[PDB]
Design a protein around this nucleic acid. Structure first.
Ligand SMILES: [Mg+2]
Ligand SMILES: [Mg+2]
Ligand SMILES: [Mg+2]
Ligand SMILES: [Mg+2]
Ligand SMILES: [Mg+2]
Ligand SMILES: [Mg+2]
Ligand SMILES: [Mg+2]
Ligand SMILES: [Mg+2]
Ligand SMILES: [Mg+2]
Ligand SMILES: [Mg+2]
Ligand SMILES: [Mg+2]
Ligand SMILES: [Mg+2]
Ligand SMILES: [Mg+2]
Ligand SMILES: [Mg+2]
Lengths: 150, 115, 183, 29
RNA sequence: CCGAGCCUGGUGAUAGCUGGUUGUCCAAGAUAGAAUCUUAGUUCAACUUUAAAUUUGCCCACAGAACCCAAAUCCCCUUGUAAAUUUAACUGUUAGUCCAAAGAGGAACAGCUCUUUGGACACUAGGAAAAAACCUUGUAGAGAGAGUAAAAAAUUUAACACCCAUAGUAGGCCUAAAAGCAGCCACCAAUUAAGAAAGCGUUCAAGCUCAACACAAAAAUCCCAAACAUAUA
RNA sequence: UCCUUAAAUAGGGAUGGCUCCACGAGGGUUCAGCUG
RNA sequence: ACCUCGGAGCAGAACCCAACCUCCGAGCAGUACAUGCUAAGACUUCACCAGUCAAAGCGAACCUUUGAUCCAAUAACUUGACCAACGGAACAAGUUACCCUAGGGAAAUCCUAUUCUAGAGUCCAUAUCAACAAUAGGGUUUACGACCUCGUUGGAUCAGGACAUCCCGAUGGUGCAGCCGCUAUUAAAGGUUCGUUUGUUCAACGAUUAAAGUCCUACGUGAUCUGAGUUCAGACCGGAGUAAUCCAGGUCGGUUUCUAUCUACUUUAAUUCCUCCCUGUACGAAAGGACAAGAGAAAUAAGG
């Protein structure tokens, strides 16, 4: 840009824009979602016995084999967001279930307990421990699940 | 080209905000201007120089009283960037012949008949 | 024809006559059958090479079934070679179709920087936003003194320095250059 | 060499502009 | 000291060219068109000076000034003002410089060549570093008073979601095969979550990501006031 | 294009057209020698 | 080519003006033969000269492009050529380097490096290179007949400086296993050859070198020297011209001179290269082939 006359430069400087200044900083001042809702609501009545695990340390093939051995029975494995599962606990009135589902959580919804054989399968892989569940509105810890299996 | 500037008439239409700011009532306007030259006519067009001479504002900072009438105001509009205009205020009215020699133009623009 | 059509280097039949650079553009300032475009933030001259590179860089990253691009500036006609005058605020290349602004932002910005004059990649939403915020600026500025007011009233005898075109440009347009920040 | 506008210069220009605005008001009646 | 000797005379040749042009003090005093064997000159005009006569002069509010198809200008009641015109006499300057603005010199942005409007310089002073042309400011003297005018450059920019993606089937056409990456055609479908894939790499596969779950710059003698972030506007 | 030097914008050779005997402080080139 | 005049661009709105410039046409043609005579008042090409319009009146009928004076001719009214360089010398061209005097003066269109990646790059962009464009930096040109043409320089001596590094130093990467090459960052302490042809400014060639850098310094530097060459004054050849003469267009020849007044200044830890050792070691499949460190030789530079 060619140099302006200095008087014109002064004019531009004086006529420069002045933004309004707030007195106090405003900063420093004070359908898949519903599909999941309805599906989980239906599942909570469909299932009779429920359990949860942490099926994340497994490979793709190992998870596929585990899914196959579970589908051998009538049990179905589920994964659902904790972000939406946390409201579900209070919606279904499961207060004791709040300190149970955090991070990765894999449900094992069923009506016929093959938990004996599932624990036997889990035994050959000395990890992925069973986490407490709640059958028919009755919370069962791991010891309760073992006793029920036996 | 550089030419005479025709100031749009809306420039000389005061607003109520202006009335509050400057303290002049549009009804009952002031009769006389006190005009002082505060800027040099050098580097200004010959017509501005001529208007300054006509108005008698050759000396800077020397108040000159003029009528607040449209013709004088047109000349003042021509040279408005070189002058300061303030209304002449007469708290005690225009001086009488007895005290014509005892007047004083206060810096506020008031011609007082006591000095 | 969902592509930028080739333009002639020179018109077949020269035309006699009908500064085209200074000041805001008056035509093609608004979107017509498009959704994105390149806006000229300053006047200048577009060469045949400039046009050819516009066409090349647009039709290269082009989806004919999802993008259609059109010119807004005619072919180089002004003799100097032939060029096209462009004023500030003039759209150069328009685009439309089933697409999103970020899908084209990258190469639109690249080609705008390629352009000889200041240019910007502008969607319809961005154009409306900048026009609205310019209006907001000129409505909420806290400066009692504006170029428009001072120039129109000849305050300080400033018209001795300014141009007659400055009274209409209100200080925003200075020569071919355009100053959007200038309120 | 380029020249730049100082805050003092801007203030001086603003003072002059204020005087001129008052001139406008007093010429408006 | 010969592209034409020397001396004297005509002769104080002529020179639109160069140089010079001597007391004091005051005052008025500025760029300008035409013609010209003319552009290194001159004459007329314009300006300028003196004297004189007389009465209006400048500024300008409306009104008014073209059809073809912008800024402004002209004109003058008022008004602010005091000059203007005419008469007599007359020199000198006048083919300038720069700045701001609008245009032309081919539908040539800058540079130049011109035209126009305005300013300044050739005239004082203050400031911008020094400073003809920018800003402030002029009428003249003395003062060991005062209020001000213009007048001080600004700036210091790049981290980043995390996590990994089973499978109807390498979806088919041709393509040696080209499967998601050679191309076109639909672009569905399983779990819960899902592109017949937006980008790397394979003749083709294989291997990798995205998405999905999940949680700016420079140079030549030697840088160039010193320095300073927070004491009342 | 050849010779000349390692290198060679240098040198020499493949009425007119010609013929250089001799001569030259003329203008180019060269061997050898000589040398601040 | 133009020089005067007129019309248009060319000036948007009184006039004036864009001269120079672009286009067009006129030195008139047609008509009438009151298309006469007179005369208020005006315009005007910024002077003058000149050029315009015109009421009223008289008299007949019932207009749309230039040129002065003098001088000639005509009884006169009037007329004429040249003045077109068109404010016009009545009548006079080329040339001077043999010269003399008086003076004056001295945007587009090219290249370089980054950026977008176009793309080359064995495939592969980003190892390397690189298009159009943009950015910067440097240089050239212009508004005018788009006709042709053409408008002080080295060397020697001594060097000062920049870094945009040619070599020597230190690093990153590599489409380099080591050797290397390529690329980039940093680095200006030091160094950066001798010859043949050419006046060469250069250029090519020869032989070397670690390298034979790009520049700025008024050729850096000519009151230190010297050489061209414009171009002196002589003479040929070639071209132009009737000739005089002209033409960097070729050649042979060809004297500028300075006693220094002032400033300034006149005595401010070395680099390379080669050889050897380490090293045939590291590395490498081999071939090939290192760093770092040390020793010795030379040479150069500086000081003696
Ligand atoms: Mg003699
Ligand atoms: Mg004499
Ligand atoms: Mg005087
Ligand atoms: Mg004559
Ligand atoms: Mg003369
Ligand atoms: Mg020789
Ligand atoms: Mg004309
Ligand atoms: Mg006249
Ligand atoms: Mg003549
Ligand atoms: Mg003449
Ligand atoms: Mg002779
Ligand atoms: Mg460097
Ligand atoms: Mg001769
Ligand atoms: Mg001789």
């Amino acid at each position: 840009r060619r140099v302006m006359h200095f008087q014109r430069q002064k004019l531009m400087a004086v006529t420069e824009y002045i933004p309004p200044k707030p007195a106090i900083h405003p900063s420093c001042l004070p359908g898949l979602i519903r599909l999941l809702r309805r599906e989980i609501a239906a599942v909570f009545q469909d299932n009779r016995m429920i359990a949860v695990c942490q099926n994340v340390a497994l490979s793709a093939e190992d998870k596929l084999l585990m899914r196959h051995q579970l589908r051998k029975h009538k049990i179905l494995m589920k994964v659902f967001p904790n972000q939406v599962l946390k409201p579900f606990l209070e919606d279904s009135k499961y207060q004791n279930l709040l300190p149970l589902f955090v991070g990765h959580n894999m449900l094992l919804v069923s009506e016929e307990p093959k938990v004996k054989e599932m624990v036997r399968i889990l035994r050959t892989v000395p990890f992925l421990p069973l986490l407490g569940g709640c059958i028919d509105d009755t919370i069962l810890s791991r010891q309760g699940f073992i006793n029920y299996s036996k | 080209k550089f030419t005479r500037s025709r100031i749009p008439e809306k420039v000389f239409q005061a607003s109520p905000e202006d009335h509050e700011k400057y303290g002049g009532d549009p009804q009952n306007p002031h009769k006389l201007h006190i005009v002082t030259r505060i800027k040099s006519t050098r580097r200004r067009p010959y017509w501005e120089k001529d208007i300054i001479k006509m108005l008698g504002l050759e000396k800077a900072h020397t108040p000159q009283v003029h009528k607040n009438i449209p013709s004088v105001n047109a000349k003042l509009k021509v040279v408005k960037h070189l002058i300061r205009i303030k209304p002449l205020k007469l708290p005690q009215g225009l001086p009488a012949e007895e005290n014509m020699s005892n007047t004083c133009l206060k810096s506020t623009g008031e011609l007082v008949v006591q000095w | 024809k969902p592509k930028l059509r080739f333009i002639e280097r020179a018109p077949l039949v020269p035309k006699v006559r009908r500064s085209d650079i200074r000041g805001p553009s008056t035509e093609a300032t608004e979107f017509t059958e498009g959704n994105f475009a390149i806006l000229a933030l300053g006047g200048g001259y577009l060469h045949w090479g400039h046009f050819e590179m516009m066409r090349l860089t647009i039709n290269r990253s082009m989806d004919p079934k999802n993008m259609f691009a059109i010119w807004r500036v005619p072919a180089p006609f002004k003799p100097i070679h032939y060029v096209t005058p462009v004023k500030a605020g003039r759209l150069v290349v328009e685009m439309g179709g089933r697409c999103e602004f970020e899908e084209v932002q990258g190469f639109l910005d690249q080609v705008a920087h390629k352009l000889p004059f200041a240019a910007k990649a502008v969607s319809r939403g961005t154009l409306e936003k900048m026009r609205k915020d310019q209006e907001e600026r000129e409505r909420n500025n806290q400066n009692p003194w504006t170029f428009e007011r001072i120039a129109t009233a000849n305050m300080l005898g400033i018209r001795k320095v300014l141009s007659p075109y400055d009274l209409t440009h209100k200080g925003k347009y200075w020569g071919k250059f355009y100053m959007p920040k200038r309120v | 060499r380029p020249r730049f506008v100082s805050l003092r210069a801007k203030q001086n220009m603003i003072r002059r502009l204020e005087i001129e605005a008052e001139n406008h008001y007093w010429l408006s009646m």
